[PDB]
């Protein structure tokens, strides 16, 4: 969390730089981090799965 | 230096083993297909549609 050139994510294993949306911008990673299926049941709750 | 194998005879030799090498590929194809129950390939085969 909060590492890399894009203020999102950085995977230390082979240098994957991701942005705050989870998208690949630098490094060897082929695709964007997976967005799980989710929905908000109210203003305070989120149900992922 | 694979030029040693380049000539008329060698060319005749290659043609002679073509049907055999082709058939040996037919065996390997079906062979993998059947052994892994290749979903992709097998769907086309009549009677082997066990779904």
């Amino acid at each position: 969390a909060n590492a890399g050139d894009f203020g999102g994510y950085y995977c230390p294993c082979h240098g994957s730089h991701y942005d705050a949306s989870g998208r690949i911008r630098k490094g060897p990673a082929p695709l964007n981090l997976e967005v799980p299926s989710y929905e908000f049941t109210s203003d305070d709750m989120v149900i992922v799965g | 230096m694979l030029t040693r194998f380049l000539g008329p005879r060698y060319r005749q030799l290659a043609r002679n083993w073509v049907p055999t090498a082709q058939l040996w590929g037919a065996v390997g194809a079906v062979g993998l297909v059947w052994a892994t129950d290749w979903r992709l390939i097998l769907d086309w085969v009549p009677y082997i549609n066990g779904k």
Binding site: - | R4, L6, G7, P8, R9, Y10
Partner: protein, 105 residues
């Protein structure tokens, strides 16, 4: 002929001394890697050369064992280096290629 030939020749004489087999009393053809063509040519050498060749190699293996070298005086001078094996090997290669041409027809 002129400066040009001498330069290549002296570049060659330099590598030779650097290759350094002459320090072990060896000759260029003694270091040749033995393959089929080479085995046959070694086989075709006349008695004298074959004998000399074995003693040379023995002198060297013996040195390479105790990791010593020959006195400078006895190194094998470029020039003075006899390509004894070459003509034989060339003929052995020349023979094989004939079979190889024949095998294409």
């Amino acid at each position: 002929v002129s400066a040009s030939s001498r330069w290549l020749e002296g570049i060659r004489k330099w590598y030779y001394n650097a290759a350094g087999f002459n320090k072990l009393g060896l000759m260029r053809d003694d270091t040749i890697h033995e393959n089929d063509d080479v085995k046959e040519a070694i086989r075709r050498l006349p008695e004298n050369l074959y004998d000399d060749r074995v003693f040379r190699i023995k002198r060297a293996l013996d040195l390479s064992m105790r990791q010593q070298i020959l006195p400078k005086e006895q190194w094998t001078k470029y020039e003075e280096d006899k390509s004894y094996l070459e003509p034989y090997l060339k003929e052995v290669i020349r023979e094989r290629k004939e079979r190889e041409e024949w095998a294409k027809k």
